Amino acid sequence: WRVWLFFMRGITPLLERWLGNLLARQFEGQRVESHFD
Amino acid sequence: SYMLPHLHNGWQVDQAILSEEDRVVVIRFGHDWDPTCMKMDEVLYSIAEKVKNFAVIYLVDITEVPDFNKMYELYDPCTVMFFFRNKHIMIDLGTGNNNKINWAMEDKQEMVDIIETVYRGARKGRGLVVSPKDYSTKYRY
Amino acid sequence: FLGMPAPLGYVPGLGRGATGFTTRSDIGPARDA
Amino acid sequence: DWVEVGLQVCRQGYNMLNLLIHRKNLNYLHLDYNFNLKPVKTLTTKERKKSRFGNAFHLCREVLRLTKLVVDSHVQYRLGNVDAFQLADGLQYIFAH
RNA sequence: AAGGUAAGUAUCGUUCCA
Known part of the structure; x- marks a missing residue:
């Protein structure tokens, strides 16, 4: 029973952030050779 | 990036789409400071003169013009939209999204390839054109 | 034309009769209309 | 009561x-x-294609299904549908499968 | 979970909204 609760404390901020981005008034969403040129 | 013409407010981009009939309007929505947007805003530099006959390139900062974010889904860092005679020309890539190129590429020939294909399919009067290359992978191996 | 202020009464988008698209449900904000 | 809280959160x-x-x-x-x-x-x-949700929505729905399963098992216990031994075995089956 | 939208032209219904 406890294992899924440690999984819960692990995933709580991920979902609390994804839902916050989703359920909000305003929504928000090979790179080194492009860096120094 | 900085060399290409820029649009500052919502009216200007709509006019730029409307003020042309015989070319294709290739608009790079995004942020010119983005590492992704700056990767392809130099490809669009290297071919701006070449495609002058059938393409005009305008740049738009979505923060400066927050009028098309919701309607055209401007939430990927970089977006490319093709317009012909005030009509968004859908293009079928290997990717699931068939309305935009939401990734910055590297080769100056493939972008001219895509622009010329869009022009060819738009003179006929289509709404969805088919790209030559398939972007369901990256051909890396 | 380039280098001109936006009209006061202009609708910022869709004034040219544009049609938006919804590729997926997650992307974008809520319709709220 | 906890079971009320579960039926509320579901x-x-x-x-x-x-x-x-x-x-x-x-x-x-x-x-x-x-x-x-x-x-x-x-x-x-x-x-x-127009109605598709990312992995986050599906994960949230499935964890809600897990907590709903647990709450409904406890309700079954409270409604006399199952025994306390049956409730414990069912909870262990939920948390092990 | 995807990488699987053909693009269109019609009348009709509805609804918010100006």
Whole structure:
């Protein structure tokens, strides 16, 4: 029973952030050779 | 990036789409400071003169013009939209999204390839054109 | 034309009769209309 | 009471997920009370692609299904439908499968 | 979970909204 609760404390901020981005008034969403040129 | 013409407010981009009939309007929505947007805003530099006959390139900062974010889904860092005679020309890539190129590429020939294909399919009067290359992978191996 | 202020009464988008698209449900904000 | 809290949170999460479903006003996706997302009619391809959710939404729905399963097992215990031994065995089966 | 939207032209219904 406890294992899924440690999984819960692990995933709580991920979902609390994804839902916050989703359920909000305003929504928000090979790179080194492009860096120094 | 900085060399290409820029649009500052919502009216200007709509006019730029409307003020042309015989070319294709290739608009790079995004942020010119983005590492992704700056990767392809130099490809669009290297071919701006070449495609002058059938393409005009305008740049738009979505923060400066927050009028098309919701309607055209401007939430990927970089977006490319093709317009012909005030009509968004859908293009079928290997990717699931068939309305935009939401990734910055590297080769100056493939972008001219895509622009010329869009022009060819738009003179006929289509709404969805088919790209030559398939972007369901990256051909890396 | 380039280098001109936006009209006061202009609708910022869709004034040219544009049609938006919804590729997926997650992307974008809520319709709220 | 804890079982009341579970029956409350199940309704709250079900309402959240139905709001997320009816966020773009796509009526061809329906969430049941067991947190299973089903189409009300056979999906045309345009509507199928138009109604798709990222891994985060599915993960939230499935963890809500897990907590709903636990709460409903406890309700079964409280309604005399199952024994305390049966409730414990069912809870162990839920948390082990 | 995807990488599987053909693009269109019609009348009709509805609804918010100006």
